[PDB]
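Annotators were shown the component list below and the corresponding predicted structure, then asked to write short factual statements about the assembly.
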Amino acid sequence: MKISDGNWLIQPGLNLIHPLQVFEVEQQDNEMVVYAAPRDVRERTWQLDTPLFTLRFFSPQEGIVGVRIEHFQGALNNGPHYPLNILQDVKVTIENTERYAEFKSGNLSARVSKGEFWSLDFLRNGERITGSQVKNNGYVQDTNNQRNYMFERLDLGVGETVYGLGERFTALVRNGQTVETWNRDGGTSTEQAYKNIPFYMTNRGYGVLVNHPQCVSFEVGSEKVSKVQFSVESEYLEYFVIDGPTPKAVLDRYTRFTGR
Amino acid sequence: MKISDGNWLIQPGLNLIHPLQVFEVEQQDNEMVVYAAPRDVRERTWQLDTPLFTLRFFSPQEGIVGVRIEHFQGALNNGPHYPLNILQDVKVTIENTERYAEFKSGNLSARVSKGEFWSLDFLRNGERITGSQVKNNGYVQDTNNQRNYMFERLDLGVGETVYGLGERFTALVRNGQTVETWNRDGGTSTEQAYKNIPFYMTNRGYGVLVNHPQCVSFEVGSEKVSKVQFSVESEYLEYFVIDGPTPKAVLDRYTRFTGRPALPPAWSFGLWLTTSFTTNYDEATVNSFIDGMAERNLPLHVFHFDCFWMKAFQWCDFEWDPLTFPDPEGMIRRLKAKGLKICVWINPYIGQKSPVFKELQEKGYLLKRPDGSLWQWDKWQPGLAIYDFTNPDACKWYADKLKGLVAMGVDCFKTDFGERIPTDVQWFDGSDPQKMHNHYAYIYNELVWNVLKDTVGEEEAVLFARSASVGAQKFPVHWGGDCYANYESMAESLRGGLSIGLSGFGFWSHDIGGFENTAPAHVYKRWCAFGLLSSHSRLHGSKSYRVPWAYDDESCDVVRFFTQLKCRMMPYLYREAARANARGTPMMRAMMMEFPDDPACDYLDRQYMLGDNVMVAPVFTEAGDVQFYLPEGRWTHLWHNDELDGSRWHKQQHGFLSLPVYVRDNTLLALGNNDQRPDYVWHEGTAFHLFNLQDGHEAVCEVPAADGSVIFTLKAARTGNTITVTGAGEAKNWTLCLRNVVKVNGLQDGSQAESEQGLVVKPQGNALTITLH
Amino acid sequence: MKISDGNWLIQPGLNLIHPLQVFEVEQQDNEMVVYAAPRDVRERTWQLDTPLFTLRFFSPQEGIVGVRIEHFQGALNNGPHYPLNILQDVKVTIENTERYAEFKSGNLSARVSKGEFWSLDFLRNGERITGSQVKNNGYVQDTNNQRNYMFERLDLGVGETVYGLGERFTALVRNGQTVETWNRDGGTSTEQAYKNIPFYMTNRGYGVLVNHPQCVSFEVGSEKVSKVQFSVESEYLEYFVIDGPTPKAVLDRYTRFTGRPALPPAWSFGLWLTTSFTTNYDEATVNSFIDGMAERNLPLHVFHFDCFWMKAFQWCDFEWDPLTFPDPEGMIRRLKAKGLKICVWINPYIGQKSPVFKELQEKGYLLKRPDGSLWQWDKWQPGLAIYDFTNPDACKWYADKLKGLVAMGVDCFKTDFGERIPTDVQWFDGSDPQKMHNHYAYIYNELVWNVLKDTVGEEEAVLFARSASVGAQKFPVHWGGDCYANYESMAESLRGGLSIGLSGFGFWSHDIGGFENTAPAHVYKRWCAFGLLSSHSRLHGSKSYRVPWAYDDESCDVVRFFTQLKCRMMPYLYREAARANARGTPMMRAMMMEFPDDPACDYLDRQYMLGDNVMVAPVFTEAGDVQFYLPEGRWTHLWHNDELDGSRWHKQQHGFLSLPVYVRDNTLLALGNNDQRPDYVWHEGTAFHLFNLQDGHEAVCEVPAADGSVIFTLKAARTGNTITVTGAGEAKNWTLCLRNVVKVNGLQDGSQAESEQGLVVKPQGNALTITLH
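Structure shown to annotators:
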């Protein structure tokens, strides 16, 4: 789903807001909540007449970090939900310092930078395997059709190739392709797939599950060439980063999480 | 809403039908029904394939005539409706003649002409005060948007000016304007209004209330230059014409009809001071201000905690910010011990970030859309939702938070917001969303009022309310909202205040020195004078503090002078306050309401009567030039004691410790002996002041008890050169000052002493006769 | 047009950009150009990918500053344009400094603040009289309709009221009202106007013309309460600030700039009588009226033939109905031999039934649609088409027809209609249809006026014109259109006439007795007094005759009395009319224009000044009750000779031969000795009248010749109890009444006789001195 129009502009009729500044961090047992403003809210005068994102970091399994980014909590949100194996007591570490809010499960953490330069990073023993740069996630208000979406873009590094997203018949490596995760009867000869799964993995040894059984619209280095973009029509976005650090070890965690 | 297109044409796609011929009249016990055809139907061949209007005339109160004109009765007509006081038993006359069908209540009748020349006339003792000419009412079928409307246009005579319609900030006199009665959060500088009332009145001594809580579209000489047109999206139209025949008499009936302003506690009349809004504040800022006032001998009676008593983005979840205010109860106790009353900011919305939001969503206490999801937007707070006050459990929950704060020492509430209520929703009780928009402000304020009534008691209940709707005058103190720190906005605030009093509200405050922006000292000084000469006086700001020393030293002298003054005028002021409760006569009165026969007062909007006897003209310039008109009589400055002849305009210049504050002649005025506080024994130590008693006149002065009743009545009657002073009731240790009278021939039953304002007389044995030189 | 949604929000679908920071200031000879960014562009990184406004300040006349704010310059910007008088060599000053860019003409300057805090201020010798605050001007992109606009809001101070905007019939003072300048045929009873002019002035002594002939949407304190907002569908906005500092000086520059009222011939100041509209008339009816006037000794000067001088449904074809008017030339000679001038109705449309329509269609002289077919509808005439006055041959054809009527004895034309000009059309000259709509009224009246100028001569040219646009004031007599026969409509007409004089027009008439409906005698009688104390006086109606005997016997006396009076006032009146031509000072002046320093005059709209010296207050009630305000001075009733102290309101009762007509003090007024006609030798038999000459004052009276130049000046100067009287120029057999002065001490160079009005002096020897007792 096209959101930007090149580097400089945005698709006509789209109003974007982004999480840009940590306003508050709150540890809720073994989950970390980050409240994040779409503008500078350091002064009281700006602490009103603004949207606000609520981000929740949690861990359903060792070495999987779940990220929920949320706009309005008042929407309906009915099932079904994916058949996920979720533990309530995975051992995690939460570090809330002046500079960072870091949530860690096994060797994998999510870290949000406080202050002027927002950053969301996923680290494997303190080395960055991917992340979301400022303004690369948030809420899309589509003024043409009155629809609203949440979206993320996770970085791709040099030489990083993307695989999966179900049983597809286009080129094996996904970089360059758009994919809609929506089951169709289209044979084996087109971009359509009978068997869609909103999970991908890379040759950098992590994987990601976008936690949304509706259509998820993936722009796999097809909109921003060095990022995997996903968007979904929803008041919240939830996705899981799944550590490896090999493809086999990602699949091990992914099938522990979703079914053997 | 535009209906005609000039004199000759109709707006494209509008089809109109009007009542044009009386077909039948029927008296139904104490009501009159006129069936009216939109065409000639004398012949049976035309007594079919035509619409018919049904007009019903009735009286809910003496001298109020109700007019209900209906097209289809089959519409849903859901509530809420206005909290009207309707009597079943009002005595009326109905005459159904050959020529006319006539419905009369008190001095006021509605007459419809039968036969070829239809006419709907409103008569006072058989004289036409207004009315609807043929084709000036009826049904509009709007073929462009598939909506249907009922409308009326009531005539305006030569020199007839229109007032009211709520707290509005445009030109005082409404002739020329379009007004939509629809509450909005639009500031004080636009045509929008937080406080809409579909009631207007004219200088001809009648009012009219258009009995529709949804949006009424008034074209006040703005479509048809000599009629007030009103239209409403509805299958019926209902309105009340309310007889006077003075503005005060109109208001008396209107507030009998829709609700009397409650008498606020004497203490509310003192000086209020606020934290200000997005400024910084904790216990020590607060104490720093209370002490800063006391150090400077600046009386202070009420302190207000604004929005940041709660955690940001969690507004109106009622939880004290624990890092700013670690011990709320203790803090209130300390602040109250130095004699202060405490107010805290509240509103009827809540932001998603509050832990309490999820509680409220689970319980179904928040306003939902038709599909069952929450109504939410990002204005004011993120994921903001609205308390559904149609849900009885929701009301109890919110009322319980309030009882919670009261129990802890909170005396009163600023009921902010309440205007941007959405219509694309489903209320708990299934009300019509179009009527709920405005009625919400009433339900909200009523609930808060009732908490105070049930805890601190009725006599102690007071609010500081931003929005209002018909009936809300019962839950007093309304303030003029988010004004700016300059003279034009000071002026517009005043038009707002004059207007709200013309729409049924007895008490009115505004933000001294302006809410938004920081006033130059000179503006702050002028506004203080105005502020402390209004029913309620509050120092409050958006981005900066309103302590006088934030401006300059002289500012403290201004605050002290006029705070002292106001405390001293309390025996007069509180008696004028009982009148608002009794008669709906506002304390701050437009010149035309106090002097309705004087053609020079029609347009005055930069000056006012503060109660019956004192004219105040705030100074809206730095240099202090001010022009003001004085009605007939010889007026006396309240403290300068200089005199002016009236029936003319005057021009003066005043420093910051001064402004025109003139007393009418034939006036007897009670000042008090406490200049520190507004709530005291007014009937003890009282100093009376007699101003220019004319041969054959009586000046009467009623000093009130704490509950507003008259405890003591002093009268001074002049007959020749003899003035007989008679007291009645309870008063101790009082004096009487003959203003501008240096020497006297004789005195009976009192001693005299000289002062630079005039002779001071102390009574001893009652008769007190003073024979002038 | 609504831009903001209250103080905080903007209308949905609107995107706005404002000049917020000066980027560069460039002086271009006598013009100052400011480039202004819609955001901070102090840094190169922000000097791209942004809109930029270009503001150009220039001066077409001394004390007029032009302000042109542009967005894109590549729009077509086709004419027509207003007929502005633009000088190239006005002495200006341009100062470009660190803090300010300032452009000055005469006493008026525009000043832009550089740096962080944008401001546009209009200064009069360095004091702010108005201006534009940041974000109160710019570009509106309406994404709902894809229309684009330019806007401005100019500040209003405390107590500043707004007037003008054309002949409008709503409240006189504009505050609170929306006005769109778009000519319409709407009658006199609505917000619509036949004569729109996007020029307003205020009681602060400046005016503003918004230089756009297409619709200008004004919100006069109706969106922002302390601002006049004007917006226009354009890529640039241009407006002129016009210095005073008094209303009359504003109007002097305004009319120098857009056109001086021409000086009508003296005869047009007489009484006009009409055929009426849809009554019957042939030659016999016309003569019966005219002889009926003569028999009752009612002078009559002009006779008007309305629409049915032509055949029904052929209107605008200039052919005399041969069955109603078999010998037009011969009829007209007879009328002229009875002392009459002749006017006939015309308009700029033609119905399809006329044998002439086909000739005009074949020649291409009618307004066409873009496909080439004729624009037609059935309003007014069946298959009506419009003469396309951008086609030079069509102008000639219509001008030749009019020359034909003049050659037949017609003296002037009633230029009716001209307002409903459609925009879905292609003009012959390729004009912007949005600009032609209003400008058509100007081109139309110009063509007719030029015909008169080229036949009867400029000095003889007069019209009776219904519509108007900027500059059409050069083509006098404008009449107020289709009013109703009731007091409310009489009052609304007066508001229109006061407004038109406030908008640059010097002369103004209205239908005595109302147009539509038949006035009860009382109404007709009051209106007769009003019409004959207006610059131009015409008896005209829709469905009934307007001859006085048709109302009652007394109506004949009223017409007689007031016609005689007006003819006797001509020496005074014609001089005041010269003042309209020379300075654009209208004859009928709002109280506020004549007494700009009097705060009691701001809203006065039921009375007026007729010339410099006489206040007239029409009576608007059957019983004859009237209230009016008199400014400072001792005033004397023109014929009752009773005196009143000024600077206050008065209440009186007048019978039908009377109304308040009051002459200010220190006045020397000339009355003529012919009460049968307006056009006579004013300077012979002149009866001068001196009213309350105060010690230290001089009174001056200038008697005009027929061409408006002064032929004689008389002065009376009082030093102690000595009044010296000196006359200069040409005058014979004149006299001097010392009003309300029964007895003098002494008289040098004169004889003295008695009168009811006071001592009457006849001079001889000249030096003429009088000593008071």
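Statements collected:
1. The longest strand of chain C covers residues 147-155.
2. Residues 665-773 of chain C form a domain with the Immunoglobulin-like fold (CATH 2.60.40.1180).
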